Design a protein around this ligand. Structure first.
Ligand SMILES: CCC1=C(C)/C(=C/C2=NC(=C\c3[nH]c(/C=C4\NC(=O)[C@H](C)[C@H]4CC)c(C)c3CCC(=O)O)/C(CCC(=O)O)=C2C)NC1=O
Ligand SMILES: CCC1=C(C)/C(=C/C2=NC(=C\c3[nH]c(/C=C4\NC(=O)[C@H](C)[C@H]4CC)c(C)c3CCC(=O)O)/C(CCC(=O)O)=C2C)NC1=O
Ligand SMILES: CCC1=C(C)/C(=C/C2=NC(=C\c3[nH]c(/C=C4\NC(=O)[C@H](C)[C@H]4CC)c(C)c3CCC(=O)O)/C(CCC(=O)O)=C2C)NC1=O
Ligand SMILES: CCC1=C(C)/C(=C/C2=NC(=C\c3[nH]c(/C=C4\NC(=O)[C@H](C)[C@H]4CC)c(C)c3CCC(=O)O)/C(CCC(=O)O)=C2C)NC1=O
Ligand SMILES: CCC1=C(C)/C(=C/C2=NC(=C\c3[nH]c(/C=C4\NC(=O)[C@H](C)[C@H]4CC)c(C)c3CCC(=O)O)/C(CCC(=O)O)=C2C)NC1=O
Ligand SMILES: CCC1=C(C)/C(=C/C2=NC(=C\c3[nH]c(/C=C4\NC(=O)[C@H](C)[C@H]4CC)c(C)c3CCC(=O)O)/C(CCC(=O)O)=C2C)NC1=O
Ligand SMILES: CCC1=C(C)/C(=C/C2=NC(=C\c3[nH]c(/C=C4\NC(=O)[C@H](C)[C@H]4CC)c(C)c3CCC(=O)O)/C(CCC(=O)O)=C2C)NC1=O
Ligand SMILES: CCC1=C(C)/C(=C/C2=NC(=C\c3[nH]c(/C=C4\NC(=O)[C@H](C)[C@H]4CC)c(C)c3CCC(=O)O)/C(CCC(=O)O)=C2C)NC1=O
Lengths: 162, 172, 148, 162, 172, 162
């Protein structure tokens, strides 16, 4: 996965050289940037189910027709598996926080997203604004330094969906 | 390619669950003590010619039948390839030391090296001996207290030794 | 960006091949997860359409990489006279090693067969094995076979 | 040249995509300790005369054969050239420090060093020993993080020469 | 592809003398406001699709001939090319902003871009209006104080406006 | 500002006559009370930082459940402001000790307390437990009288919180 450490190593590897000053510079930046990110991951993980419920009900409130009979949100399976999808997005945002890179997002979600959304007719907007709800909720769930990191990854997910 | 964080993440994802509190504690400790890791990786990077040269001196002063005619390090092209392999293995050990995970080593240097050395006739026992000699020369350099603050890094010594032993045991 | 460059015409198809070879997809698949032997095999197969002819090619390209980097390693393939004569600026590379190419060794055909793996197969690296090298012993022991 | 911002921008432009979390983190890691680098460059730009004369005299001491007549070390213009060479190296170390990377160091000293040195018959061990003395005295003129940056950059120069 | 540091080193080597005290002090300042710079470029990156969409809406509203048949943005292909050019321009603007130097923009994004549109028949005046509307939207998204700590960044807004405006002038 | 002499003045001025025996005797009594309270307040001003910090950690220890993500006090700034709150109340304890009355307390903090707590969702019981910690120490720190009126003042403070 593409992180700071891995990107450093791959760059110093493809060039066939040892790790010089700039590479250890970036590595150190990652290592001390870790602690806010780890705390953000702990908070998001602790507040996981509440965040998922909130994002699901935000999808339904903003997209009221979706739960009406005959289309996507109708029926219990599609709601339970909406919860599943939001849980996946949240899990990979925390993964990307811990790794301090957009590796896990760009691998397990962003890579191959448009094809599977197209082939299942899943509107991206549902996920974009569920991520917007989580983006807002981290404002009162986190604060300080780690809030910028969490917002940054929620943000990258939203941009990739759009 | 991997590191410690991505390894824990991959395990958790294959299982399907968020990262537990204990694993977050482990990764936080790793990141907190990674400054010593940067010093070790710098000790390997900055002295690498010394490691390679001392290991070569010792290897060719104990195993003469490599530099003899018909030995498999005889001409300058084979001796240069010997030294180049030594440097490359040391390079991937420093990589894996920075990453904290030996996946880059096992994927770029070690996944086809025993077969290559057998297909070239190079005695993989002597290659492993060269790797161990590089390990010794490096440990002389990672324990250097000059230009760095005093502290304990027994964990990093053990980790680097295990990377050198992985290279040795996957070539031999 | 590379596709836009190609559409405008600032770069020929060969320059676009060069950009894709230096791209991060090509690295992450063929370089980063594989030894140097497998990387040279894949570079020959993909940018030249042929398998390596002998061990001196592997030695030369490994030293070229170790001394000058991935960009020079790739340039040695695309700017080579062989690519320019076979494919030139404006032809997409193709597997030309199936029909006798002037100067090839006897083995190049067998090695390309070993690399091919069928029309369905691919140079994935998502295998259970992890993109091992196929021609390690067929290049330095072209004829014989040895058991450990 | 090649500074941390330079690789960040180059890598971001290569994929043709905006700067994500990792690039900003690398730029932050460069930015936050720009100050030990700049203060180290300031500390070793005041002592440049002492540095150059010390390096030249240490090179003369370590290699007695480069002093007596019949060789390149002997000569008033040749010793002026030696002092100018050491001044150039030290200035490019300062440039590497202020850039917070090896870029100016690379594309002023390291690139094309072997054949330029060789076509004029100059021993690399000469400049290696000069930079070793510069290492020795910058270990004491600088303390702590600035000392770390100095040691690292001068040693990168040495490894390039050696 | 130069930043302020590389550029200043270039002039310092042109002179041949060491770097002064005052310029090094202003470089240290640049480092200190580097965090506000990173938040500026982050605000630009985070909202890139929104900026492109709103600037496109306003531009196509102001010049209906672009949309109508025979206009330069009529078919889906040409509209997609328009939006992609807008995004590329904004991407290089953010690149220059983080580099703190307009060199990144001018050295690769603006060399043959001025005449390619003319050879294509593309009205460069419309491109200038597009990047102007982009500048307006980017300013709106930059003055936002939500989720970030507040302080003085007027130099950043002026610098971004200069980057957008000289991109407009060079294209036009 | 209703120190005992202040309501003495209020009772005197409310009607037309001068000060009789009772208020003079009460003023005298307060004027010998002034001393042991004055050493009490001085002793507490000597022991400021250790006592306030220990009160804060006691609040953590008796209320651990908040310490999780969920404190209004969670985060360095919020814990520090817990400490400054305890410091403010210690200020007012000392001031009322000197004033020989609830003056500072009821004038500033007790005035409009409950509705402020409702607005800011700050449970008084935390403060009460902090003052019980203060009870524990002040049982030792002060002796005899000083102890007695200090305890009585902080009793009135507890009751104000309730
Ligand atoms: C790696 C992470 C990952 C993601 C993100 C993911 C998304 C995903 N969602 C799917 C189905 C679905 N997803 C939804 C989501 C909707 N449900 C509610 O109504 C909301 C409006 C909305 C969610 C906000 C729905 C309705 C389906 C069923 C549609 C269908 O069966 O065609 C499917 C098809 C497979 C299946 O679930 O049967 C995928 C692949 N899958 C993954 O493995
Ligand atoms: C640009 C690349 C880079 C380098 C070179 C670097 C070195 C570096 N080493 C440090 C401390 C240290 N360095 C070492 C390592 C030494 N002590 C052990 O006994 C051995 C002699 C040896 C390692 C085997 C230790 C143990 C510490 C203190 C650990 C800590 O910071 O908590 C510190 C923090 C200052 C301090 O807490 O004292 C830095 C910045 N950091 C970087 O970003
Ligand atoms: C090096 C940086 C770079 C630039 C500068 C760039 C611009 C650019 N725009 C192009 C086409 C185009 N460009 C536009 C956009 C303009 N026409 C409309 O009127 C708009 C008002 C206006 C946009 C603001 C359009 C509509 C086309 C389509 C013309 C065609 O397809 O032939 C092309 C050729 C075809 C292609 O891109 O595939 C280039 C190279 N691309 C780059 O990689
Ligand atoms: C990128 C990671 C990677 C590495 C490092 C690697 C090793 C490697 N070593 C080789 C040859 C060689 N390797 C050696 C080294 C041995 N000789 C002595 O016995 C020593 C004990 C020992 C070295 C310590 C020698 C002498 C050759 C040349 C043999 C020949 O030319 O036939 C070759 C093929 C031909 C050549 O390089 O000229 C490879 C590919 N392969 C990889 O994919
Ligand atoms: C900024 C880039 C730069 C570098 C790196 C540099 C080194 C350098 N020094 C030179 C001259 C020289 N340099 C030396 C110094 C060496 N011989 C002994 O005296 C010493 C032991 C030793 C120094 C440690 C001497 C004697 C010459 C005389 C001409 C020659 O030997 O080629 C030359 C040949 C052309 C010239 O400058 O006159 C170069 C390239 N010059 C540069 O403009
Ligand atoms: C080559 C031929 C061609 C087509 C077909 C085309 C489609 C097209 N329709 C547009 C406007 C639009 N068209 C619609 C209509 C949709 N919304 C609802 O009314 C309906 C369900 C549905 C149509 C039946 C809407 C809502 C917009 C405005 C979109 C927006 O401004 O965000 C636009 C954006 C123009 C602008 O306002 O800047 C395009 C590109 N463009 C072309 O050049
Ligand atoms: C890892 C990548 C990264 C992030 C996430 C980042 C956000 C960030 N903003 C900061 C402070 C700040 N950031 C700003 C800039 C903002 N203030 C105004 O609202 C402007 C509109 C706006 C400019 C776009 C200001 C004024 C400060 C406080 C002054 C200072 O930095 O010392 C700080 C340092 C102190 C802190 O807030 O804890 C960081 C790390 N910086 C980074 O390098
Ligand atoms: C003498 C007048 C005075 C009073 C009455 C006082 C209490 C007080 N507590 C406040 C909020 C707060 N009070 C606390 C401390 C409490 N929360 C934790 O749970 C602890 C258990 C507990 C400490 C005993 C915290 C953490 C806040 C921040 C909550 C917020 O800002 O909404 C505020 C709002 C102003 C601010 O944000 O600093 C005041 C004035 N401080 C004073 O100077």
């Amino acid at each position: 996965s593409r992180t700071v450490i891995t990107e450093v190593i791959a760059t110093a590897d493809s060039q066939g050289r040892f790790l010089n000053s700039t590479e250890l510079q970036a590595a150190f930046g990652r290592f001390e940037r870790a602690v806010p990110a780890i705390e953000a991951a702990r908070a998001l993980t602790k507040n996981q189910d509440a965040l998922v419920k909130g994002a699901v009900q935000a999808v339904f409130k903003k997209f009221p027709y979706v739960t009406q009979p005959g289309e996507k949100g109708y029926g219990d399976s599609n709601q339970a598996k909406c919860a599943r999808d939001i849980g996946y997005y949240l899990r990979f945002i925390t993964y990307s926080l811990v790794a301090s890179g957009t590796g896990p997002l760009d691998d397990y979600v962003i890579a191959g997203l448009r094809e599977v959304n197209r082939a299942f007719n899943l509107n991206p907007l549902w996920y974009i604004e569920a991520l917007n709800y989580i983006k807002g909720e981290t404002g009162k769930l986190l604060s300080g330094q780690s809030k910028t990191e969490a917002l940054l990854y929620i943000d990258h997910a939203i941009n990739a969906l759009s | 390619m991997n590191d410690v964080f991505t390894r824990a993440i991959a395990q958790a994802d294959l299982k399907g669950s968020f990262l537990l509190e204990s694993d977050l504690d482990k990764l936080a400790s790793f990141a907190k003590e990674g400054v010593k890791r940067l010093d070790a990786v710098a000790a390997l990077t900055n002295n690498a010619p010394a490691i390679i040269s001392d290991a070569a001196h010792k290897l060719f002063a104990e195993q003469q039948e490599l530099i003899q005619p018909g030995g498999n390090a005889y001409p300058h092209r084979r001796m240069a390839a010997c030294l180049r392999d030594m440097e490359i293995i040391l390079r991937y050990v420093s990589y894996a030391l920075l990453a904290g995970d030996a996946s880059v080593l096992d994927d770029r240097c070690l996944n086809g090296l025993r077969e290559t050395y057998n297909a070239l006739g190079t005695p993989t026992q002597s290659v492993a001996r060269a790797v161990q000699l590089m390990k010794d020369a490096a440990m002389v350099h990672l324990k250097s207290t000059a230009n760095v603050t005093v502290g304990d890094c027994s964990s990093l010594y053990s980790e680097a030794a295990t990377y050198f032993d992985k290279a040795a045991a996957s070539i031999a | 960006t590379a596709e836009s460059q190609l559409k405008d015409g600032r770069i020929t198809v060969r320059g676009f091949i060069k950009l894709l070879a230096k791209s991060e997809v090509y690295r992450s698949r063929f370089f980063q997860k594989t030894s140097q032997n497998r990387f040279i095999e894949l570079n020959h197969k993909l940018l030249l359409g042929r398998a390596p002819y002998d061990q001196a090619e592997i030695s030369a390209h490994l030293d070229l990489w170790n001394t000058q980097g991935y960009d020079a390693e790739i340039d040695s393939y695309v700017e080579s006279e062989e690519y320019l004569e076979n494919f030139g600026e404006d032809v997409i590379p193709y597997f030309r090693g199936f029909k006798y190419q002037t100067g090839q060794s006897a083995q190049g055909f067998n090695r390309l067969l070993d690399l091919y793996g069928g029309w369905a197969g691919s140079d994935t690296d998502r295998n259970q094995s992890g993109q091992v090298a196929r021609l390690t012993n067929s290049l330095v022991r072209p004829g014989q076979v040895v058991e450990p």
